[PDB]
Amino acid sequence: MHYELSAAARAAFLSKYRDFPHYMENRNFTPPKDGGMWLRFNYIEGDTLYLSIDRKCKSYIAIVQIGVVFPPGSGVDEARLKAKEIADFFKDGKMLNVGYIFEGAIVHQIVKHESGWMIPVRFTVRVDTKET
Amino acid sequence: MHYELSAAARAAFLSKYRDFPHYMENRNFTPPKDGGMWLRFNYIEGDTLYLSIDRKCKSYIAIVQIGVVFPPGSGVDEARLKAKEIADFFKDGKMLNVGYIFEGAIVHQIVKHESGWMIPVRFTVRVDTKET
Amino acid sequence: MHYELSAAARAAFLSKYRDFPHYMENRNFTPPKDGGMWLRFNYIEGDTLYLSIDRKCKSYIAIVQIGVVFPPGSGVDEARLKAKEIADFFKDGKMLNVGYIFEGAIVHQIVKHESGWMIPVRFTVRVDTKET
Amino acid sequence: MHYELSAAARAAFLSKYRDFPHYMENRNFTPPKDGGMWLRFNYIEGDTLYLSIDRKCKSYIAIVQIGVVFPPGSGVDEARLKAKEIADFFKDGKMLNVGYIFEGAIVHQIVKHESGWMIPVRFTVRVDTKET
Amino acid sequence: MHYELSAAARAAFLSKYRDFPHYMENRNFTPPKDGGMWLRFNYIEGDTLYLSIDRKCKSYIAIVQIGVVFPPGSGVDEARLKAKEIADFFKDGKMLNVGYIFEGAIVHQIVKHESGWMIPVRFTVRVDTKET
Amino acid sequence: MHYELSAAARAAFLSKYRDFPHYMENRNFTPPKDGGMWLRFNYIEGDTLYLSIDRKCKSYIAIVQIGVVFPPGSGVDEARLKAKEIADFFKDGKMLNVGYIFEGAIVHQIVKHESGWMIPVRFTVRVDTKET
Amino acid sequence: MNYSQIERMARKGVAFFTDPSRPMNLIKQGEYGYDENGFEIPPMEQVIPISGATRRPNAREIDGETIRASDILGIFNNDHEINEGDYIEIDGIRHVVVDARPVQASLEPVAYRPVLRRVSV
Amino acid sequence: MNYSQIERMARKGVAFFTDPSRPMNLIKQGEYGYDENGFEIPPMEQVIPISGATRRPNAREIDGETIRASDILGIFNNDHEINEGDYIEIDGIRHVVVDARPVQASLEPVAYRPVLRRVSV
Amino acid sequence: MNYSQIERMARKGVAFFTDPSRPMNLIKQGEYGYDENGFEIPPMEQVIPISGATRRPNAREIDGETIRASDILGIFNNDHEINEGDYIEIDGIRHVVVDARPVQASLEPVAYRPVLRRVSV
Amino acid sequence: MNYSQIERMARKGVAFFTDPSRPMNLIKQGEYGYDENGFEIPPMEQVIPISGATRRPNAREIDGETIRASDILGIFNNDHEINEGDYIEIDGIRHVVVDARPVQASLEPVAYRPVLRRVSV
Amino acid sequence: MNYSQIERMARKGVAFFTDPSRPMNLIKQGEYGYDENGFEIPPMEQVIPISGATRRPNAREIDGETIRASDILGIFNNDHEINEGDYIEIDGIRHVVVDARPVQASLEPVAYRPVLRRVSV
Amino acid sequence: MNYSQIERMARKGVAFFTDPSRPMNLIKQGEYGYDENGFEIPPMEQVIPISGATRRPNAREIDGETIRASDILGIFNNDHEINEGDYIEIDGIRHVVVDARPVQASLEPVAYRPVLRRVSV
């Protein structure tokens, strides 16, 4: 149960942010001509845990990272505004249509570059299953 | 008993995926002309554990890795579906003709390259043997 | 909430050191022509802790970095004195208008470069919040 | 006492595989023109232990590594078989002329190079001594 | 209180060895013409410890490093003698006019370079302060 | 007291092997024209332990490493013979004129190079003093 | 100036070092977009004929695993402009245009000098 | 000596290898400064027309995510002096002037050879 | 144009710097395929005569074990097309073609400049 | 031999490629030495007007912090000898002589080719 | 073609840049083989005279212990063919032939350009 | 052949680019050897006047610590041979001969081109 979780995460994020420019997995995407902020989408595969002794009830953990990029020389508080709003929308305990948010709304330190800055927001999703 | 482990793993995987384009160890293989996905086969040698005090009852552990490669710019959902099907086929406790799968059906994070992407699936097989 | 922490830190720092030339986040800044010392404001984000079992009382921890830079061959004692002034101003337990200083006034070993030396001072701010 | 142990192990291997092409320590040897499999001989020194409080009874440990090389594009089954007979021949507890096999018959993971592949087989030997 | 500790250590050192050629921090200095030995002065900041719950009594640790450099091809015994003399002078328990030597007279490994060799000598100074 | 330790070690080693080609610290030395074996002398200073609470009883450790070199293409058994000869001479419990050997006669792994091979032999010496 | 003169000269030069017997094709994919549930497939190929010049072959080694791949650099005309991630089909072997590199001193580049990397690995 | 001659030669040289149909612009932002609370916005654009020449395109690869961006160099005149953080509008695509590089041996530099990197990433 | 001109020139050039007394051969292996249990062998050799030239010898050093092997480059003709995984028999010594490097600007490459690396290690 | 010839030639060459309108200065500090307690200040500047030539600007980038600094190399005459730690005032901006590099073949070097790194960072 | 001419010119060139006063020698050891117990010595030297030229000496630095060794390259004739592990004596100083580098496009190489590394360390 | 002519030309060339006003000295220490207890000093200097030329000055930089040292190369004649660890006194500053580099093709080298690094650090 790993394909469905990624599909659900994409569905939720995309339904929240249809209009705003974004980049997804393995699709040739060009940045906006104006160079304004756009979103990055990533999926990180965590380990899978075997719960019981009979090897039948399992769990799946995944990490979702959304990156807000912005041009140099234009400040950072707009990016921080976008980040807090993303985190508030992706709160803990929200029930996705296949799984649920194990722990959400984490912001890490900004990575700095000479062409454009990016700030990540990372959270984790979980789905538990019983094979019968 | 280590030759038979590779023999049995090859037998099972090859019986499952005769027709799919696949690459085996140390054979000059060329990728398909159209750029479609192909499978990769590797075998990894684990340690051998001494169980008794008289050094007669032994064990053998092996790691088997299957890689799914795909061209850039063609998405990831079909590759994830294929990985899910591989994991479903390789269930834990499946009985090989010489040994058995110790724990299986694990999907690791995607390795990304500018020429093409690869998803690895890794599992382990084990044989307990007796000497007289 | 994370923007308010940076806003309060900027307010306090900027009110205390308005006139002194200083560098803000992501603004194209040129050093003084004479090469005199200038301030370098920086912001580092830490983790966020979920304290309770209902996931309602949270904590935000942030690291604030102030770096002083001075030309080579001009001595180091005056730079140390300035850093001591900064640390004495940023004393422990100060009540920020949104959060509070968890612990401040720590000076670390000097970093040496062939074009100009730098002394970093570092402290941490913390905000405890209850969600309703 | 470390010289005689190496001499005896070398003598045993040489008496077993006198005819088959092989490479020894620090002697100029050229690989076969046809490119068939040839064996590599190596010796490793271990630590020496003081057992008592009067420093009279000691022990000597050694590690022996042997290698099987094969050309690319020739598969792996012949090499794995050959390693299997080597491991069978070098079984645990066999007594040498000066010492004995402390722990034997181990096969490690294949090291891959684009010019030719190698499989290592490693074991360890021991001698116990009392000097009056 | 970190300025005064550096001032005291410098005062003691230069009172003991005013005449002998030496280099001190952040001042352009040229080595002796004849290539004879000379002294190096360094200062390293330690950590600052908060002792009590009310954060009113603190401590400052500093490390002082003095190196003796000597030309290649001239032996080591005279350098060792000079280092021994320095260590004997800078003994434990000596009282500076601000702080005191926490523990001193340590000699470390020779660092080898093909242009000239160096022997380090390191000790530590401490100040315990109570702010009212 | 660290000068006399090196003095004593050099005295003992030179008294044992005055004639044989050897290399010492910081003296220009050219290897034999024929290319036969020769010895290296290295001195490593250990840390000084402070035993008591009145800071008056002191200890000094040192490590001595001697290497034997030999040309390629000429076997290893003569080198092993010479190495175990050195080890036999430097036995445990021997009393120097200043300190004493803590342990001796340890041989390690062969280090190989394109131009010649070397084998190390390492031991350690100790002195203990009480200051008045 | 007169970039039309550079254009005509580049066209004749590219036509000089080309063989009108190597099947070359150019594939442009685009206009994807996901479903409300989060999965779909872009059904478009947009394959067109093309011809040009190639030089500087190179082979690929990854970790000694004997994959036997190769990569090329090319020279092309200014018709059907090359994008940064297009597919180039050469003799049944597909490559991705990793870099366009238009020989440019003005808009409407006179020619392209792309770098191609073989598909998959 | 007599840098006016060099100025004239540079002016005609830049006018030679240029196309008067590439829309290019210069954007200069400046005079910011935060509020008493610690946040505000600098309300100024300062956009002006400009013309020049470019060379050596180079694609950008970060780690293999198919981002498809590029960066170039430029050759410009001696009017509307360039800084190390100015914005260059190239056919609707903005770039940052990372390096100014004025071709200089005297005050009032004759020409500039800026290095331009595409904005965002 | 007229790639036959280049073909003839390359053939004559290769014939110039060659010795018709060095025993040289080419080995092609192919058509494998495993048993229902997972082990078998392809029983074919496919050896053919060939002639050419070599240049730039280089010894092989791994870590000082004194194995004493060497590696070379080649120049060959346009017959018996060289693949990426073939063997070359040189004067009693076999090498593997690690790199093909066809000198090419059209189909049926005029000549090959392969890189040969000695078999085993 | 005859180093006066090359001295005059170098002086005239420096005079040719110079601007007599760029305010340039040279600052030498020296003769420090600490108080009996361990802190004091060297109270002297020793500034002297100088003229010369510059070439090859280079931008300085640290980690993406947008500091906008630059560095230059210089050519100068054989008066007011250059030391390894002197300051150079270039058109209202200070630089440190990281390396002097006296073009030499004998005593009394004929000219200096220093490398100047911008003050601060 | 006609490698005899190359043989002759190479021999003449080698004979040109040589000094007939430097004692030079070659050592070939061979035919080893171990005793049933596993230790023995090869009792053969096979010393022969030789002459040639050298170029490009180099000093050797390991880690700063003042060991003061040197290394050399050589050029030689086509007589007494060199192997990959032979010894060369150069005026009281021995060296080992690491690489032979036969200058060759055919069989019976016309000359050798070996690299000699000083024995021991 | 005839290395005498080479010697003459080398001596004349060295004598050309030189100044007879820079004091240069040469220090040879040798024949040490420890006392029966393990400590003594070699009491010999062996100072000899030398003349020559220098080129390519370079600065020395360790970690930004402001030490201001320099290094130079030299060209010298073929008397008072240079060993691998001698001292060269150049205008009040000592240097160690790190590499000698005799310009050699035969016995009795005609000149040395050593590299000198400044003593201490």
Short mmCIF file of N, CA, C and O in Angstrom, two decimals, chain E residues 58-94:
data_model
loop_
_atom_site.label_atom_id
_atom_site.label_comp_id
_atom_site.label_asym_id
_atom_site.label_seq_id
_atom_site.Cartn_x
_atom_site.Cartn_y
_atom_site.Cartn_z
N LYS E 58 28.94 32.14 36.78
CA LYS E 58 29.40 31.53 35.55
C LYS E 58 30.90 31.26 35.61
O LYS E 58 31.59 31.64 36.57
N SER E 59 31.41 30.60 34.58
CA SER E 59 32.83 30.31 34.47
C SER E 59 33.25 30.44 33.01
O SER E 59 32.47 30.17 32.10
N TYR E 60 34.50 30.85 32.81
CA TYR E 60 35.07 31.00 31.49
C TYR E 60 36.36 30.19 31.41
O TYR E 60 37.23 30.31 32.29
N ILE E 61 36.47 29.38 30.37
CA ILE E 61 37.62 28.52 30.12
C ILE E 61 38.32 29.00 28.87
O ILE E 61 37.67 29.35 27.88
N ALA E 62 39.65 29.03 28.90
CA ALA E 62 40.42 29.38 27.72
C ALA E 62 41.61 28.44 27.61
O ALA E 62 42.09 27.90 28.61
N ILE E 63 42.09 28.25 26.38
CA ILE E 63 43.22 27.39 26.10
C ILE E 63 44.32 28.23 25.47
O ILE E 63 44.07 28.98 24.52
N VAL E 64 45.53 28.10 26.00
CA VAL E 64 46.70 28.82 25.49
C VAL E 64 47.65 27.80 24.88
O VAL E 64 47.98 26.78 25.51
N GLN E 65 48.07 28.07 23.65
CA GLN E 65 48.95 27.19 22.89
C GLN E 65 50.18 27.97 22.46
O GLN E 65 50.07 29.04 21.85
N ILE E 66 51.36 27.44 22.78
CA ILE E 66 52.64 28.04 22.43
C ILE E 66 53.44 27.01 21.65
O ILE E 66 53.66 25.90 22.14
N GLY E 67 53.87 27.37 20.45
CA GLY E 67 54.63 26.44 19.66
C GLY E 67 56.07 26.86 19.48
O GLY E 67 56.36 28.05 19.35
N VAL E 68 56.99 25.90 19.49
CA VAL E 68 58.40 26.17 19.20
C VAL E 68 58.72 25.58 17.83
O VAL E 68 58.49 24.39 17.58
N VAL E 69 59.23 26.42 16.94
CA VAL E 69 59.53 26.01 15.57
C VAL E 69 61.03 26.07 15.37
O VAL E 69 61.70 26.99 15.85
N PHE E 70 61.57 25.07 14.69
CA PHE E 70 63.01 24.98 14.48
C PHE E 70 63.32 24.49 13.08
O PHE E 70 62.52 23.75 12.48
N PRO E 71 64.47 24.89 12.53
CA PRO E 71 64.75 24.60 11.12
C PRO E 71 64.97 23.11 10.90
O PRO E 71 65.41 22.39 11.82
N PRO E 72 64.70 22.61 9.70
CA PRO E 72 64.98 21.20 9.41
C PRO E 72 66.47 20.94 9.34
O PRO E 72 67.28 21.83 9.06
N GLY E 73 66.84 19.69 9.59
CA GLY E 73 68.23 19.29 9.53
C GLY E 73 69.10 19.79 10.66
O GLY E 73 70.31 19.92 10.48
N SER E 74 68.52 20.08 11.82
CA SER E 74 69.27 20.65 12.94
C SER E 74 69.05 19.89 14.24
O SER E 74 69.50 20.34 15.30
N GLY E 75 68.37 18.75 14.20
CA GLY E 75 68.15 17.96 15.39
C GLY E 75 66.90 18.35 16.15
O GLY E 75 66.12 19.22 15.74
N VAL E 76 66.70 17.69 17.29
CA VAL E 76 65.50 17.90 18.10
C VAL E 76 65.80 18.17 19.56
O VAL E 76 64.91 18.67 20.28
N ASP E 77 67.00 17.87 20.06
CA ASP E 77 67.22 17.89 21.51
C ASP E 77 67.14 19.29 22.09
O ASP E 77 66.59 19.47 23.19
N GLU E 78 67.67 20.30 21.39
CA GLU E 78 67.59 21.66 21.91
C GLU E 78 66.14 22.14 21.97
O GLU E 78 65.74 22.81 22.93
N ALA E 79 65.34 21.80 20.96
CA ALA E 79 63.93 22.15 20.98
C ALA E 79 63.21 21.47 22.13
O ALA E 79 62.38 22.09 22.81
N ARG E 80 63.52 20.19 22.37
CA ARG E 80 62.91 19.49 23.49
C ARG E 80 63.30 20.14 24.82
O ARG E 80 62.46 20.27 25.71
N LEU E 81 64.56 20.56 24.95
CA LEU E 81 64.99 21.23 26.17
C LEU E 81 64.24 22.53 26.38
O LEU E 81 63.80 22.84 27.50
N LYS E 82 64.09 23.33 25.32
CA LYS E 82 63.37 24.59 25.44
C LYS E 82 61.91 24.35 25.82
O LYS E 82 61.35 25.06 26.67
N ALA E 83 61.27 23.36 25.19
CA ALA E 83 59.89 23.05 25.52
C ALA E 83 59.76 22.59 26.97
O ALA E 83 58.80 22.96 27.66
N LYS E 84 60.71 21.79 27.44
CA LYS E 84 60.70 21.36 28.83
C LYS E 84 60.82 22.55 29.77
O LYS E 84 60.15 22.60 30.81
N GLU E 85 61.68 23.52 29.43
CA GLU E 85 61.79 24.71 30.26
C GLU E 85 60.48 25.49 30.30
O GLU E 85 60.07 25.97 31.36
N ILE E 86 59.82 25.64 29.15
CA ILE E 86 58.55 26.36 29.11
C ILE E 86 57.52 25.65 29.98
O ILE E 86 56.78 26.29 30.75
N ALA E 87 57.44 24.33 29.87
CA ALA E 87 56.49 23.56 30.66
C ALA E 87 56.79 23.69 32.15
O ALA E 87 55.87 23.81 32.97
N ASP E 88 58.07 23.65 32.52
CA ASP E 88 58.44 23.79 33.92
C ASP E 88 58.04 25.15 34.47
O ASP E 88 57.57 25.26 35.60
N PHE E 89 58.23 26.21 33.68
CA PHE E 89 57.80 27.53 34.13
C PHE E 89 56.29 27.61 34.29
O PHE E 89 55.79 28.11 35.30
N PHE E 90 55.55 27.11 33.30
CA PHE E 90 54.08 27.18 33.33
C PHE E 90 53.50 25.97 34.06
O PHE E 90 52.85 25.11 33.47
N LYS E 91 53.73 25.93 35.37
CA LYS E 91 53.27 24.79 36.15
C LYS E 91 51.84 25.01 36.64
O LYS E 91 51.29 26.12 36.58
N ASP E 92 51.23 23.93 37.11
CA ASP E 92 49.87 23.98 37.62
C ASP E 92 49.81 24.79 38.91
O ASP E 92 50.78 24.89 39.66
N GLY E 93 48.64 25.37 39.16
CA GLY E 93 48.39 26.09 40.39
C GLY E 93 48.91 27.51 40.43
O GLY E 93 48.71 28.19 41.45
N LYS E 94 49.57 27.98 39.38
CA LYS E 94 50.05 29.35 39.36
C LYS E 94 48.87 30.31 39.27
O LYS E 94 47.87 30.03 38.62
#
